[PDB]
Design an enzyme around this catalytic site. Structure first.
Site, PDB file in Angstrom:
ATOM      1  N   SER A  59       0.879  -1.073   0.082  1.00  0.00           N
ATOM      2  CA  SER A  59      -0.312  -0.136   0.354  1.00  0.00           C
ATOM      3  C   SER A  59       0.777   1.857  -0.237  1.00  0.00           C
ATOM      4  O   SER A  59       1.775   1.345   0.637  1.00  0.00           O
ATOM      5  CB  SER A  59      -0.728   0.196   1.052  1.00  0.00           C
ATOM      6  OG  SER A  59      -2.037   1.347   1.253  1.00  0.00           O
ATOM      7  N   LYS A  93     -14.693  -3.457   3.603  1.00  0.00           N
ATOM      8  CA  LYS A  93     -15.393  -2.143   3.454  1.00  0.00           C
ATOM      9  C   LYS A  93     -16.255  -1.664   3.257  1.00  0.00           C
ATOM     10  O   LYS A  93     -17.335  -1.350   3.809  1.00  0.00           O
ATOM     11  CB  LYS A  93     -15.023  -1.293   2.106  1.00  0.00           C
ATOM     12  CG  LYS A  93     -13.729  -0.948   2.211  1.00  0.00           C
ATOM     13  CD  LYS A  93     -13.803  -0.874   0.599  1.00  0.00           C
ATOM     14  CE  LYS A  93     -12.688  -1.886  -0.002  1.00  0.00           C
ATOM     15  NZ  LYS A  93     -12.605  -1.113  -1.908  1.00  0.00           N
ATOM     16  N   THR A 137      -0.251   4.352   0.750  1.00  0.00           N
ATOM     17  CA  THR A 137      -1.251   5.136   1.768  1.00  0.00           C
ATOM     18  C   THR A 137      -0.956   5.044   3.187  1.00  0.00           C
ATOM     19  O   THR A 137      -0.457   6.431   2.969  1.00  0.00           O
ATOM     20  CB  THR A 137      -2.876   4.452   1.724  1.00  0.00           C
ATOM     21  OG1 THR A 137      -3.146   4.754  -0.301  1.00  0.00           O
ATOM     22  CG2 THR A 137      -3.790   5.083   2.665  1.00  0.00           C
ATOM     23  N   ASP A 148     -13.229   6.940  -2.817  1.00  0.00           N
ATOM     24  CA  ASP A 148     -12.373   5.979  -3.185  1.00  0.00           C
ATOM     25  C   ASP A 148     -13.733   6.639  -4.339  1.00  0.00           C
ATOM     26  O   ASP A 148     -13.795   7.205  -5.496  1.00  0.00           O
ATOM     27  CB  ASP A 148     -13.110   4.477  -3.450  1.00  0.00           C
ATOM     28  CG  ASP A 148     -12.232   3.312  -2.522  1.00  0.00           C
ATOM     29  OD1 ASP A 148     -10.632   3.625  -2.843  1.00  0.00           O
ATOM     30  OD2 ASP A 148     -12.443   2.884  -2.191  1.00  0.00           O
ATOM     31  N   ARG A 204     -22.330 -10.731  -9.925  1.00  0.00           N
ATOM     32  CA  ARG A 204     -21.571  -9.818  -9.259  1.00  0.00           C
ATOM     33  C   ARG A 204     -22.341  -8.305 -10.204  1.00  0.00           C
ATOM     34  O   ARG A 204     -22.118  -7.416  -9.796  1.00  0.00           O
ATOM     35  CB  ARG A 204     -20.180 -10.175  -9.188  1.00  0.00           C
ATOM     36  CG  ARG A 204     -19.558  -9.435  -7.833  1.00  0.00           C
ATOM     37  CD  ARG A 204     -18.074  -9.632  -8.094  1.00  0.00           C
ATOM     38  NE  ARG A 204     -17.318  -9.774  -8.891  1.00  0.00           N
ATOM     39  CZ  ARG A 204     -15.941 -10.335  -8.199  1.00  0.00           C
ATOM     40  NH1 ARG A 204     -15.871  -9.810  -6.810  1.00  0.00           N
ATOM     41  NH2 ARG A 204     -15.317 -11.212  -8.579  1.00  0.00           N
TER      42      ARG A 204
END
Lengths: 281, 281
Positions: free
Chosen positions: A15, A71, A17, A108, A161
């Protein structure tokens, strides 16, 4: 006052981030620590999401990001959730206030939307195809149809999905913006569209190639990619060769952090600095 | 790599320890966050010590300090404990390694001992009186008798507290170094001694005055004080007026942090910088 942040998820070694937040906090005169909280890693493995969230509250974190597989799971644990994150059913950003209460957001969505503004300012958005409904595909689709896309066709190997994602987005925006379409023969659908976004891991070194046959592209298409490792994916190379406008995956990845940093700290982040950090890793 | 630390205890608002660690980490090129984890405060109130310790492990802390009321309670929760902390039965410093395992230390002992070396280098140590067995009095007594004090008389309002401390220390060092003595009439005992240390909160703005009648001091005594708010306590003022050598409470408070910082990080702390930070608050 020093700033304490983290990211709860799985498989977080690469990551970018944490570095982006640490550098920007420091650039703004505030010592900042941003810890990976990886439930496949050496510290947090096997702990429940609620345990880790509560831990952050007790130990003085000012915020968290949340990634896969948490999430959606994190929503019911939060005190408040933004209407946008509520409707998507996914939160990637949690702001922790002085008393240890939590507000969920989704940067996001805002980050991809900003990427569209920044990288596709002249793009025709009437008809777009998105390949992939997993990963951040949900946020990407939501951003697309809330930033000018009239018709979005989402294709996934798992048709159910793609349809589930379509139902979530359509409910969130209040119109039939998204339709699930078959992944097989997606080339014909793309050829008729104005633009196409890859939201699969295809293009990454462990998933080489493209999610569809790039010969279906023309110079008039624009092409976007969620993948940023590498920045220049085979898909984006093929698009660029034709003269297509492109949106690379760095924009969303940087802007989700820009927007989260603002939410966590109340400071106005310097985008160029956070972009520099991102590219330096 | 950024450094993440905290302090578990109660009533931590005025602690100078977080600032000392944050500044020194940054001075050494490492963004450092040091959070209070105050179980009377707005985040961690009502949580068990084990919950908070585990939280630190999961969320990537590199170390903790521990203070009242948890310095004894924390021992059984740790993976390893230094022999010195084991014998005292108190830990103020916990180093967390990569896999989330813990080693307990006591830098109150080492810090006071260093204070004695730094501030009382010529002091006669044959016979010393310590007033107060609570707070960091246990670490102070241990440091005294392991840094040259032959006979320590510890007085406390609660005679049983002083005797308990005496038994712990004597067992730790393997000789009758410490004897509990009555607080009433302690002046006569001090007058016959070489030095006296205050380990009560007396001298602080909410506990004004002195723990004994300073008229019993002479110019030949040395006097130490655990209190550092204010730095120049009424006791230390009275001692200084007589020409007594003095040991102020800043030395232990700074050196416990110096030694903990070294343990947490493997870096050699700059004492003068940490002292500067301490005095700046």
């Amino acid at each position: 006052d020093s700033i304490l942040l983290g990211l709860i998820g799985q498989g977080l070694d690469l990551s970018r981030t944490p570095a982006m937040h640490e550098a920007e906090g420091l650039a703004q005169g505030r010592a900042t620590v941003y810890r990976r909280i990886d439930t496949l890693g050496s510290r947090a493995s096997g702990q429940d999401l609620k345990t880790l969230l509560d831990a952050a509250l007790y130990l003085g974190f000012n915020g968290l990001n949340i990634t896969h597989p948490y999430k959606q799971a994190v929503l019911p644990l939060l005190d408040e959730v933004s209407e946008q994150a509520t409707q998507l059913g996914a939160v990637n950003t949690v702001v922790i206030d002085a008393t240890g209460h939590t507000t969920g957001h989704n940067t996001d969505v805002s980050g991809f939307g900003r990427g569209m503004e920044e990288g596709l300012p002249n793009a025709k958005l009437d008809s777009v195809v998105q390949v992939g409904a997993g990963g951040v595909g949900n946020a990407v689709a939501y951003a697309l149809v809330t930033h000018g896309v009239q018709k979005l066709q989402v294709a996934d190997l798992d048709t159910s999905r793609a349809q589930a994602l379509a139902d979530v987005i359509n409910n969130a925006v209040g119109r039939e913006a998204v339709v699930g379409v078959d992944a097989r023969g997606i080339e014909d659908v793309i050829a008729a569209a104005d633009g196409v976004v890859n939201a699969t891991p295809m293009g990454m070194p462990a998933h080489p190639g493209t999610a569809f046959d790039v010969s279906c592209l023309t110079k008039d298409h624009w092409v976007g990619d969620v993948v940023y490792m590498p920045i220049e994916t085979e898909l984006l190379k093929a698009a660029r060769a034709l003269g297509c406008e492109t949106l690379d995956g760095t924009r969303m990845a940087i802007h989700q952090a820009v927007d989260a940093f603002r939410l966590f700290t109340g400071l106005e982040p310097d985008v160029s600095r956070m972009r520099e950090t991102f590219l330096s890793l």
